[PDB]
């Protein structure tokens, strides 16, 4: 075939029921996630080729960057609740990996403040139980697939993207191949 299990994707031998349709994991500490987000715009290009009626979910993970890592998962919970993912993603990536000015929860918060979320609104979110459950979900979803590496994408709880088996000569070509795989898996 042209799409083979084990070549552009793998199959979970322990499929996850009731999963988000398209589910992506990242970490602001993860160098390839940095590339995926601002150089490649994977999420964006996947969305453009996804079918009618498909929800795209993106979650942060704890297992990189110790204490800041968890903080970052809480702050991504905040970003989701306030619907400001689009406004903090880029400055969080550059804060952790480029400029290295994010060293504490406080520095994380600054990115939000500078992006126009108000202090009280952020702090309110930060401490809210609605955020607490969104942290739970991120953890639960990573747990359900025993996730040990990012970036990572799963489709319908049963297939996992395998980017190491796609050509990386051309970056544009890598992305289309990646997205087309997701669409393929989506229709399966």
Nearest CA to 65 out of 111, 27, 110 is that of 27
Residue (of 22, 25, 27, 80) closest to 49 by Cα position? 22
**Pairing label, strands 22-26, 56-60:** parallel
Which helix (H) or strand (E) segment holds residue 109: the answer is helix 105-114
Distance CA 71, CA 5 (A): 36
Name the one residue in this structure whose structure tokens are 């990996």. 97
CA 57 to chain centre: 8
Deposited resolution, Å: 2.5
Question: Considering only CA atoms, which of 130, 129, 160, 125 is closest in space to residue 142?
Answer: 160
Residue 59 structural domain:
1-188
Nearest of 136, 132, 95 to residue 115 by alpha carbon:
95
* CATH number for 118: 3.40.30.10
- Provide the token pair at 116: 């126009």
Helix (H, G, I), strand (E, B), or coil: what is residue 3?
A: coil
Give the distance between the most distant pair of CA atoms in the chain: 55
| Torsion, Cα of 178, 184, 187, 188 (10° steps) | -120
Range 130-156 burial, b when 16+ CB lie within 10 A, else e? ebeebbeebbebbebbebeebbbbbbb
Tokens read off for 115: 């992006």
Domain count across the chain: 1
β-strand 152-155 against 9-11: which pairing, if any? unpaired
As beta bridge partners, residue 155 has 22, 159
Q: State the method.
A: X-ray
Q: How far is CA 136 from the centre of its chain?
A: 15
- For the chain, after which residues does the C atom lie more than 2.5 Å from the next written residue's N, i.e. where is it broken? none
* DSSP 8-state secondary structure symbol assigned to residue 154: E
**Short-list 131, 136, 178, CA closest to 144:** 136
């Amino acid at each position: 075939a042209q799409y083979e299990d084990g070549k552009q994707y793998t199959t979970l031998e322990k499929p996850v029921a009731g999963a988000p349709q398209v589910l992506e994991f990242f970490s602001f500490f993860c160098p390839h996630c940095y590339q995926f987000e601002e150089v490649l715009h994977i999420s964006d290009n996947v969305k453009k080729k996804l079918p009618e009626g498909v929800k795209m979910t993106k979650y942060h993970v704890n297992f990189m960057g110790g204490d800041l890592g968890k903080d970052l998962t809480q702050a991504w919970a905040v970003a989701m609740a306030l619907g400001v993912e689009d406004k903090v993603t880029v400055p969080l990536f550059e804060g952790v990996q480029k400029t290295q000015t994010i060293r504490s929860a406080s520095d994380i918060r600054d990115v939000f403040i500078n992006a126009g979320i108000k202090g009280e609104e952020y702090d309110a979110a930060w401490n809210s139980f609605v955020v607490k459950s969104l942290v739970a979900q991120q953890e639960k979803a990573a747990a359900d697939v025993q996730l040990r590496g990012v970036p990572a994408m799963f489709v319908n709880g049963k297939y996992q993207l395998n980017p190491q088996g796609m050509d990386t000569s051309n970056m544009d070509v890598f992305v289309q191949q990646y997205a087309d795989t997701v669409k393929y898996l989506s229709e399966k």
